[PDB]
């Protein structure tokens, strides 16, 4: 365990740093709350009853320099400096994916769940009922359970903090999983899925004519599933109302499943567009502030509006539908925009953005049932462990590289791959990683093939799903070739070695491959790779 100088400058719950079981009481609220030894470090846990509100857990120095993360898929987890930060001007029309919290975020530097420096790892285990964050303070490092004004008549439970020391950073992080991991009951799949996502080739202009195509051509290719993303809905929330030449939602999955794929389907189910059906039958079912509908985004060049996952009404609707999914044969979920379902607002039940949330994704969950994989995406991470199958752990890629795109969470291969990478640790913990789709067409694109290869190979290197994304008439021999040689560098342990890197390189080995221990040393700047095989 970690002694020390450092360790005797800590604050646990306002109180100096030591080992023991602990009562805070104060007006508003009471902690019962323990600080116990564990391996390579301490663990603080208990429970907590009254209106806690934004409670400070823990406070120490900030360090110069930390990994920080994003609470949804695809916001960075990045190192940053943490005495030049000045706050990010937030995008009112996606203000929850920078932040749970944006009064936080517009004033102090925050990292979500977990933050760590070079030697040390703070986490939370858990996000059940508070959101927990950390912040950057007038130089000091402080975490938080933000439990957004709820009263607990009786006690609930913490969600617990570990503190980890050990050079061996990438070592902490791994173990800081591990622990997530057991906190939660991890669904981590035997089996990786293999298959096929229209998305990053027709985006929503998918026609059914050309899904044909593709569902013709895929016998071709190493794929299992085969998965209709964004286009043939006819507005959000709207999930079994088709568009265009699309046919029933239930034929498009009698049609893939007769051409011998795994059915798959996205919805964006925590969300109901200002124009959509659900919307307008159901004004009731939304998330509010000041007894009117709140904007949970702006996408579509639509109002988006958050469910209430708090009403039983909203449940039942969400069990019906995914229910629905299953008995026509979908057995792959791409549930996407996952943040809307936990956007602080009035619901109906006095419960956090967070249990709300859980509710609803526990609902699909029973709804799809066990044989079907969910996918989470666009979603809070830590709440989500236990439920999801797969999780998108990055901004979305691109059919380019993205040299005049900003580190802000639009669309890049070079983003979705710095992503893949520094959320590593997450893979076979907390679920398995998904780092978005392989661009292999050699048409239609501006990747080269210098630049699928490190994407692909680093993919594989790190034992991530492996989903192709392409009109599947441009993938020749290279991307063929490509796609067989990444399959051959999955089923290892990754570690990447040197997490804390400024510069965009990172040395990254698998230890028990398909093609025994390999190390795939990357540059994200000059967009070159060295890959070794043992
Ligand atoms: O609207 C479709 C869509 C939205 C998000 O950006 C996802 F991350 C992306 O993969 C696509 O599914
Ligand atoms: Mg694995």
Same mark, same amino acid.
């Given at each position: ?51 806690? *509100? ?27 400096? $943490? ?21 936080? =975020? ?15 790892? +703070? ?62 009951? $991890? @669904? ?13 080739? +027709?985006?929503? %202009? ?30 959000? *929330? #709207? ?37 959509? %059906? ?18 949970? &985004? ?13 009403? #039983? ?6 069990? %019906? ?9 979908? @057995?792959?979920?791409? /549930? ?27 609902? /699909? ?18 709440? $989500? ?19 005049? /795109? ?22 076979? @913990? ?24 490190? &994407?692909? +190979?680093?993919?594989?290197? =790190? ?15 290279? *991307? ?8 051959? =560098? ?14 965009? @390189? &990172? ?21 070159? +790779? ?5």
């Amino acid at each position: 365990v970690p002694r020390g100088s450092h360790m005797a400058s800590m604050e646990i719950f306002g109180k100096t740093f030591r080992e023991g079981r602990f009562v805070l009481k104060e007006k508003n609220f009471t902690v019962e709350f323990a600080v116990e030894k564990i391996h390579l470090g301490w663990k603080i846990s208990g429970r907590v009853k009254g209106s806690p *509100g934004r409670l400070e857990v823990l406070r120490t120095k900030a360090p110069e320099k930390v990994l920080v993360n994003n609470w949804q898929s695809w916001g960075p987890c990045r190192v940053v400096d $943490a005495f030049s930060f000045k706050p990010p001007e937030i995008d009112p029309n996606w203000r929850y994916t920078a932040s749970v919290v944006p009064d936080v =975020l517009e004033r102090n530097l925050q990292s979500d769940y977990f933050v760590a420096e070079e030697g040390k790892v +703070y986490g939370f285990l858990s996000s059940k009922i508070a959101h927990p964050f950390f912040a950057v303070e007038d130089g000091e490092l402080v975490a938080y359970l933000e439990y957004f004004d709820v009263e607990f008549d009786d006690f609930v439970p913490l969600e617990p903090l570990v503190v980890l020391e050990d050079p061996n950073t990438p070592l902490l992080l791994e173990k800081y999983a591990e622990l997530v991991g057991m906190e939660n009951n $991890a @669904r981590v799949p035997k089996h990786t899925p293999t298959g096929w996502c229209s998305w990053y080739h +027709y985006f929503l %202009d998918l026609t059914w004519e050309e899904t044909l195509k593709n569902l013709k051509l895929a016998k071709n290719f190493p794929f299992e599933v085969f998965q209709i993303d964004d286009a043939y809905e006819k507005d959000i *929330g #709207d999930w079994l109302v088709t568009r265009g030449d699309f046919p029933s939602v239930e034929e498009m999955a009698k049609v893939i499943a007769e051409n011998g794929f795994i059915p798959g389907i996205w919805t964006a189910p925590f969300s109901v567009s200002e124009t959509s %059906d659900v919307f307008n039958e159901h004004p009731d079912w939304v998330v509010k502030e000041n007894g009117e509908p709140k904007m949970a &985004y702006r996408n579509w060049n639509k109002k988006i509006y958050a469910l209430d996952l708090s009403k #039983d009404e909203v449940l039942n609707w969400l069990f %019906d539908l995914f229910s629905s999914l299953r008995k026509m044969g979908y @057995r792959y979920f791409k /549930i996407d925009f996952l943040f809307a379902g936990a956007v602080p607002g009035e619901r109906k039940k006095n419960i956090t953005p967070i249990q709300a949330f859980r509710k609803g994704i526990e609902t /699909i969950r029973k709804a799809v049932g066990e044989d079907s994989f969910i996918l989470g995406c666009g979603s809070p991470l830590l709440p $989500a462990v236990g439920c999801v199958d797969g999780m998108r752990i990055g901004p979305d890629t691109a059919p380019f590289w993205g040299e005049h /795109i900003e580190d802000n969470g639009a669309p890049a291969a070079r983003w979705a791959l710095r992503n893949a990478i520094t959320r590593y640790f997450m893979h076979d @913990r907390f679920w398995l990683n998904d780092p978005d789709c392989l661009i292999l067409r050699e048409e239609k694109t501006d990747l080269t093939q210098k630049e699928k290869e490190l &994407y692909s +190979y680093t993919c594989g290197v =790190l034992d991530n799903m492996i989903i192709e994304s392409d009109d599947l008439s441009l993938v020749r021999d290279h *991307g063929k070739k490509v796609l067989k040689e990444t399959l051959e =560098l999955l089923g290892g342990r990754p570690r990447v070695q040197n997490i804390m890197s400024e510069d965009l @390189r &990172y040395e990254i080995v698998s230890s028990g491959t398909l093609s025994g221990n390999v190390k795939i040393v990357v540059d994200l700047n000059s967009r070159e +790779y060295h890959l070794e095989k043992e």
